[PDB]
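Internal ticket #5521
Category: modeling
Description: The requester needs a full-assembly model to guide mutagenesis choices. All entity lines are attached below as received. Residue total reported by intake: 516.
Assigned to: D.W.
Attached entities:
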Amino acid sequence: MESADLRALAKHLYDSYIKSFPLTKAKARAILTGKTTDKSPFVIYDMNSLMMGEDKISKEVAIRIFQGCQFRSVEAVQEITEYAKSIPGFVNLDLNDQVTLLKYGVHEIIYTMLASLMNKDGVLISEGQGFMTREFLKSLRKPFGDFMEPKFEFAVKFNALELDDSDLAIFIAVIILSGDRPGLLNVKPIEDIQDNLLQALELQLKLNHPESSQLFAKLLQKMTDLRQIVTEHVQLLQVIKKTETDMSLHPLLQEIYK
Amino acid sequence: HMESADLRALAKHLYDSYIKSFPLTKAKARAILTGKSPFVIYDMNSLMMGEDKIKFKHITPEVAIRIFQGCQFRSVEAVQEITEYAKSIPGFVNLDLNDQVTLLKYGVHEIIYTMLASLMNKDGVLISEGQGFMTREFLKSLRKPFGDFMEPKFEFAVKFNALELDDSDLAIFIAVIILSGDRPGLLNVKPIEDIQDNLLQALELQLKLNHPESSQLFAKLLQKMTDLRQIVTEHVQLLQVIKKTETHPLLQEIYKDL
Ligand SMILES: O=C(O)c1ccc(-c2nn(C(=O)c3c(Cl)cccc3C(F)(F)F)c3ccc(Cl)cc23)c(OCc2ccc(Cl)c(Cl)c2)c1
Ligand SMILES: O=C(O)c1ccc(-c2nn(C(=O)c3c(Cl)cccc3C(F)(F)F)c3ccc(Cl)cc23)c(OCc2ccc(Cl)c(Cl)c2)c1
């Protein structure tokens, strides 16, 4: 509740976010905004360039691309699980509650952090070596095209907040420590932690974006949506299953969705 | 540094930070073990009551596994506690971020063993911040490999405790283990060994003032840092073997580091 303590928490979480996630928003923007020879991505925009991209950087194309998403998603869950452990107080919660918070939190965090890798035209892939265009994804067959586009619609809205990684490190932690996840055993100690994180987020946003009116409230409002867009995801994912048994759902994802 | 006053200041800095990072000090633990009051777990029936009496945070929906999971739960807590303490080691946070992660990754296991000895005597171990005490013989008697898994910890602890180190000794010792320049994958060994050189100087002087009658205690303690490498090696092996013969994916991911 003391400023120096809230700033200390901001640095701790930012430091841990750098250690846990391979590809930051700062690196992503450097790649997307060019300026560079060395950091420049190969662009996948159609079938032919996809085949060349796998050479530079079988199953049906939309399925292959889907598996590429789930593979990274599984990695994100692992990365996020590792980040959570660094949130002061998280590993001291009831073990069942830790599982519960991760279970309902990872998807919201994945969307949030997927936005870092996106602009209105596409998404970084392969740790930023590749870039796949929105239009190519949107044009995939049967339901897979409509499956990719909502991610971009969110990202375009979220990125207009212009958060940097030090903002996102705290925002993500706030998302994890939500006392309103179904099935939680001890809501109060989770809310105690979130209160501290909310305080830290509030002070971080004012110092880092002093000219951004009510960014805190606007950022919390975005924590609103994620909840509904995650529902659409699992919904579309369910229907995909009921029509695509040519699909590998990783056990970690498998159990998250049960 | 190199002046006596500098080493004493460094010793005091590490002691104060050690006191803040760890819930149960050796001094408090020793008062409890020497009866100078905890619930005692000595068989199956008293185990069932102790999880009712003591609010265990790892009880997740067979006895020996349950106890194993409790060891893992507390260790994950210790990792975070050790991670915060490291930040107070002068120079640590200024090291290359990958090197900090590497040092912690290979150091936490040796430190957990070391500090577990603080909670142990020849007859059992304090648990749950000292509210409980589980007997050696009960742990030693667990089925399949779990019994052989617990007893080496006691065999180490009894040997280590004969050095009769106190908390101000241990605070520096723990720092020395963390700042080990021979961890695989380190990028910049020179500043790590520079700091470890300072910590070693301070440990040597601390042991001389705090144990003036203890012949070559410094050398004897460094020899014990020897062991820790190999006993941690045997530990991770048996930890692996448990997987190949025993045992949620999210829970698996929380504990993957161990
Ligand atoms: O790195 C990262 O943080 C990260 C994070 C997320 C994605 C990514 N996941 N995803 C999903 O549906 C998804 C999501 Cl959100 C959450 C859980 C499960 C799934 C799954 F299981 F159902 F998929 C996407 C749908 C469309 C798009 Cl554009 C991206 C995603 C991601 O994708 C990278 C990627 C790799 C390879 C190819 Cl080929 C492509 Cl196109 C994208 C990366
Ligand atoms: O407080 C503390 O500083 C502290 C610190 C350590 C233990 C404790 N860890 N542990 C391990 O194997 C172990 C170790 Cl050394 C190092 C790294 C990873 C592991 C893991 F990951 F593989 F486990 C043990 C094996 C046997 C015993 Cl006796 C204890 C340990 C510890 O155990 C407390 C405890 C034990 C049993 C129950 Cl039921 C409960 Cl509730 C608590 C406490």
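Resolution: model delivered.
Comment from assignee: Chain A touches chain B through 26 residues (CB under 8 Å).
Ticket closed.
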